Every structure is written in structure tokens, then in C-alpha cells.
Amino acid sequence: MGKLSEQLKHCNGILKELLSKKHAAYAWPFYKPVDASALGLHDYHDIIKHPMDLSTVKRKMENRDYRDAQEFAADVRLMFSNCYKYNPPDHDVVAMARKLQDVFEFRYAKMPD
């Protein structure tokens, strides 16, 4: 019933959509934390100080870590920003990030208030 609750319901709906099969073709790189060691990315944690991914956002939502929509959105955008910072702009993953961020931003804009 509360404003913060309702807005976080909207955030949770968005999160569910981002993780859904509908968007899997471009969402998959963002499902789990970047495993720098697995991918041979030995500079990743020197360049990306605050890693983020959708599983972490999900855990934080489930743990009631996010106190408002703004805090949730900051993590989702951090995830995209990290991708844009680390990868060259012509990399496949950047195109995927842009597409998933489009999904995010347009639905986030429909926030109840």
C-alpha cells in the first residue's frame, strides 16, 4: 500500500522481466557476476571497482536491501555502466547492454507516483 512498497513492486516486476526468456538473447551476459578469472580478464577488477549483475540485484531485492526505487535503479545502471566502461564500444556485449538498458529505462519510466 505504501509508496516505497508500490514503487519497489514495479522495480521487482522490471527485474523479473530482465531475467525472463523474452530478453534472454541479449540479457544472458548480465545474469551472473563477471568471472574475471574464468574469462582471463586479469584487469577487470582494477578497472571495475563495483561489479554488478542481475543475480546480485535479485539477491538484494529479496533481502530487502533496496529501500527505494532509486537505489535499485542505481545498481541496474551501474551494471550497464561497468559494461560500457570495460568493453570497447563496438563489442557485441555493448550492443546487448544497450538493448537491455532500453528495456529497463522505458519500463522504469512507467513508475507509479
Ligand SMILES: CC(=O)N1c2ccc(C3=CCNCC3)cc2N(Cc2ccccc2CO)C[C@@H]1C1CC1
Ligand atoms: C558482462 C560483460 O561485460 N561481459 C561478459 C559477461 C559474462 C560473460 C559470460 C557469461 C556466461 N558464461 C560465458 C561468458 C561474457 C561476457 N563477455 C563476453 C561476450 C559477451 C557477449 C557476447 C560475446 C562475448 C564473447 O566475447 C564480455 C564482457 C566481459 C569482458 C567483461
